[PDB]
Amino acid sequence: SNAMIIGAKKSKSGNALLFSGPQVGFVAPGFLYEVGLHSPGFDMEGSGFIGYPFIMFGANQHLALTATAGYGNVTDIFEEKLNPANSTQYFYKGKWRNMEKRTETFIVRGEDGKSKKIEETFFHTVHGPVISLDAAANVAYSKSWSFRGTEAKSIQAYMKANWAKNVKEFQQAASEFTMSLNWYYADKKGNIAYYHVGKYPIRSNQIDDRFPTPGTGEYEWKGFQSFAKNPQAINPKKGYVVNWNNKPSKYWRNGEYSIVWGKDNRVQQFINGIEARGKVDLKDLNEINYTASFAQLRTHYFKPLLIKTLEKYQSENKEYAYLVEQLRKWNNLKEDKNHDGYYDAGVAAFFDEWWNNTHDKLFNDSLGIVSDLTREITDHRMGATLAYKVLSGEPTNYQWKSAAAAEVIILESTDEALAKLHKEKGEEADKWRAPIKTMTFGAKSLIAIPHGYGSKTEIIEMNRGSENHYIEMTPKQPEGFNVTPPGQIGFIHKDGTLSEHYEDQLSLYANWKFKPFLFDKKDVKRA
Amino acid sequence: DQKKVENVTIIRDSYGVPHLYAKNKKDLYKAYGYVMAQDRLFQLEMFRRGNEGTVSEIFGEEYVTKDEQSRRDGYSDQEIQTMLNGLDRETKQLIEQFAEGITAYVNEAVKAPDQKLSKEFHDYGFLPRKWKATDVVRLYMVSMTYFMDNHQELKNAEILARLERTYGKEKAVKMFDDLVWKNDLEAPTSIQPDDQ
Ligand SMILES: [Ca+2]
């Protein structure tokens, strides 16, 4: 998920701006629900996740808000020391403790139509539910959520945010939210504010918080840190805040999940867009969102590395010369502006294969035996920090490859990628243009169960929020535009007829058009 | 359009988005649940089933292990009621109204199922059940917990253990620090330390 808030000084009109882009996948019915709420002293338009009694992306009369996944450290796994003579007992504070037992029944619809009945036993310790067993080592793994039992207090906190009228009330609501999210704030007075919300535990400083914590009782949480210690800022001096699930602040850690917060981070797409402009408007935010959605994210750090290597040898290798010309003219996007079904920049097909070849050569001979666990780290969708440090010759703890060995890899990957394109397409980069990846608003969301029948319509894959709001807090009222695909109404008639509002926003989404943000009842009636 | 479900006016714009106009929050949040049910009743039903670990009753064995995971890590109704009882009385009451709103459309749709129950209900041969405030909290947990929950600590332990047994502890420790760092000081940040 990505977000941007622009303070008054960074905005052309002098009004604070807000941009939302929650990434919760693409399903039909959609993962978001858009609504307008209006009661005495409470007027708010926007969308929230399906089922939530509050808006998460939009604005009330006073403030605009959005959120992104925080990726903070709110989940710890505890390594329970089991009794060798009783697997349902673990050692805690000097004495054996009995696990809590619970038998659950599951009814399963058989393909034949009838239903079967399955029984399972789940176990609990003082730290939480047992998620895994290492019986061979007399170990059980339990899971502690910092937000255990406080999910309803988080709902209440989000509802108080809806009702809030100023930074003070919004921050109070932020301070009560117990789960790990980034909150973004913009108001009609020109203020913007950012909060890494959640209840983050005070951990033992005698453990490595990238690994499970021994459950014997000496390394227990000692409460939660004060909200003042949560990353946050009101009116940061840079004049704005951008985020794509990246690190909140230089020294804020998230233990086991650091892999999302490296030098190579996809937020660079939003940093580049904002830093390449002076004062900005909603039009600008939209062009930066377009860039992020279609960018080949490895290009930021790895296309310069590639070019630097090839330029050393392009005098004698005409193919390297042609590649460097094509790479340099490429705008780093995998886009389909003419809607011919093929990405416009043919050299993007080469870069894709070059990267894949390069990642394989960097780590296969060392991590291949563990690539079932590490490939998702070293080829992460948010960035390839370790790969970049190796190829760029920057310091690493283990000497993976020298800068000279790295260059040899970059070259070998180029030769192999180019040789495959010559054999299958030809020598002109125009012929390398790859067919666009498409997707559909399907039936199954991140909760991993079916909630409908989905949608047929194929649109180009976009690394983009599942909705977008562009809001400008003008002195009069919030203003702007948004899109909430596939459509408002997920109703299918018994006879198969889709509601007229089942997917009437998919064309807007795929063609980078939007509908007006409505706040004034006068405008709502004529919409 | 501009309907009037109870003392709340509902204006649906050209995209079908409902705009609710109420005289107090109690009415507003009931209408909130009602319009969401009008538009997404089957989706609400299945999302609630996701949290309760009862999807297998509808879509079969393919979702048994997901149901088991949901119940393993989930809460009982009484546990969720205890959470609601810890909220401000107004907040609890509005969540109840939200559920009463959903229940209002449930009751309305079972009385005219051929026109108000979506096709999935007819094809899979079951009916939606009424709603309680606890179920509303369930709709929040099923989706929001996903973004907080992970077992990367266990993956990390397995990574270091398999590196250690092949390469030795000294080398594995260095490899793992490059894989899962303690703090990459050059990672882009949303705010600077001076902004705290
Ligand atoms: Ca942790």
Ligand SMILES: [Ca+2]
């Ligand atoms: Ca094209």
